[model samples]
Target: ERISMINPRVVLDENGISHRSRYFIMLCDNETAIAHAKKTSIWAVKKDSSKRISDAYKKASVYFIFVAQQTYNALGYAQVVSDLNSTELPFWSDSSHAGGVRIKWIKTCNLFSAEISEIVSHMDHGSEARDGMEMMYDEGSRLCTLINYAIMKRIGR
Candidate 1:
């Protein structure tokens, strides 16, 4: 017997439906809603970087499971390389480091554009350099902006 893949028309006919291309609309709507939720939830989970590193890890796991790949890779910023021994300490010899990671790459063009736009906007408003509390808050909260911009610029952003 020849193998045959069931066609959507056949299924729709069998079910007495119009096959009006409605299934994708339903799926896309659900996907959009889910993506919005994940974005909000990721920001919330990362509100505290130090105490919530593990929380971020868990949240990342959640995203990997349900969200599109790399939807949160932006927030998973910075690249680093390190060597660890069985005891979890940086282990090294003159010529043997067990192939430690080398974060020889990072990009921050978006972060830089965002920061420069924000800071320049504030500066254009004649906000005093030392008293722009909002700018400082931006700097503090949007630290990834600084890091990414620095790396990207350092490497030609």
Candidate 2:
């Protein structure tokens, strides 16, 4: 191996995800979700009949758990990713998954570890949704900041 000048691998936007993006947890349990994930690179969500994409979620990033495979990972957005309407895809077509958020899938840390549930349990959000699409969000908490640190470092961002 030759020693040479190293270049920075900028995995995030300058400061970090916390600087401008909201973090969310996504779960994909079936083959269809996986198929849809690879095929369209989009996740279907419940359609909001209210305001458009809400000011609350306009800037967002995601962490995903592939239930069947026990895969946990991060996903990024910049290709105009947002939670909009989900529709007209064969896997999720004619379904109630009426919303959509596109993402750029990335790495998984502690791929087979079961500790994330407990990690999330301590996130300081009072009641767990237990389960939004069976989703979760960071709610702008400090624990999530540390969590992202652990995640992004291993992701080597």
Candidate 2: worst 10 consecutive residues by lDDT? 1-10
What's the CA error at residue 25 for candidate 2, in Å? 2.0
- Candidate 2: C-alpha lDDT: 0.40
Model 2, span 1-157: residue lDDT tens: 1211221232333223332334444444456666666657676653432132344355544333332224433222222254554443435544555656675554323332234444444433434322132222233233244445666667577
* Per-candidate TM-score against the hidden true structure: 0.21, 0.47
- Can you tell me which runs of candidate 1 are displaced by over 4 Å? 1-52, 61-87, 91-141
TM-score of 1: 0.21
* Runs with alpha carbons beyond 4 Å of true place in candidate 2: 1-19, 48-54, 59-83, 86-90, 108-110, 121-157
10 residues in a row with least lDDT, candidate 1:
20-29
lDDT of each: 0.26, 0.40
